[PDB]
């Protein structure tokens, strides 16, 4: 099944993941309501998700996609926040949890900004925050997010709300602009490469 492999802080791979996370923090339109108020994270663990079965499913789909995107699977590293991170790392992403709704339909959504994914760690709009304090801006409780390999193939650009069930004909993903939201409609188009444990930090 799934094995979690810790990365050591001295490892350039750990450093690369933390740098992508810290450097993509931005101020959000909701004034910090969903994800909290912070300028940086305290990254306290980075694990690689190792699952031969899940990896085989992802590579098999990459091969299907490359054939339709002129030998390119167009992979991007993107963040994903979710209260269901335990199911994802054990069973993989699953589009069946995505229903006709959402700004860009029944897909799984990813962000270039780690702070955007941090808004979804405790639910839509941050839910009711952490389980212990019910605080969307909790500095105590440890959070987790994923940094994923996402097979985008041929992306379709969308600039208004729609409720698509699948990507348009001949396409494999939707890049939606309400900052871009990257949407796939098959769970096997994302691999949960890194599981990051972190806190948001109080501003100084
Ligand atoms: N969960 C995420 O990290 C994420 C990043 C960027 C935009 C997002 C939008 N959602 C989302 C989550 C659930 C249903 C529809 C949309 N999740 C997002
Ligand atoms: Zn808390």
Residue numbers in the entry: 1105 to 1282, 1289 to 1314
Q: What did the published study say regarding this structure?
A:
Poly(ADP-ribosyl) polymerases (PARPs) are a subgroup of four enzymes (PARP1, PARP2, PARP5a, and PARP5b; PARP5a and PARP5b are also known as tankyrase1 [TNKS1] and tankyrase2 [TNKS2], respectively) that continue the reaction (PARylation) to generate long chains of linear and branched poly-ADP-ribose (PAR) on target proteins. PARP1 is involved in repairing single-stranded DNA breaks making its inhibition an attractive strategy in oncology especially in those cancers that have defects in additional repair pathways. Thus, TNKS activity promotes Wnt/β-catenin pathway, and TNKSs are potential drug targets for the treatment of cancers driven by Wnt/β-catenin pathway, most notably colorectal cancers.
TNKS1–niraparib structure has two molecules in the asymmetric unit, and they show different D-loop conformations. Consequently, the piperidine ring of niraparib has no interpretable electron density, and it is not modeled. This variation among molecules in the asymmetric unit of the same crystal structure suggests lack of intimate stabilizing interactions between the protein and the ligand. Furthermore, we analyzed the torsion energy profile of the rotatable bonds of the ordered niraparib molecule. When the lower energy PARP1-bound conformation of niraparib is modeled into the TNKS1 structure, steric conflicts with Ile1228 are observed.
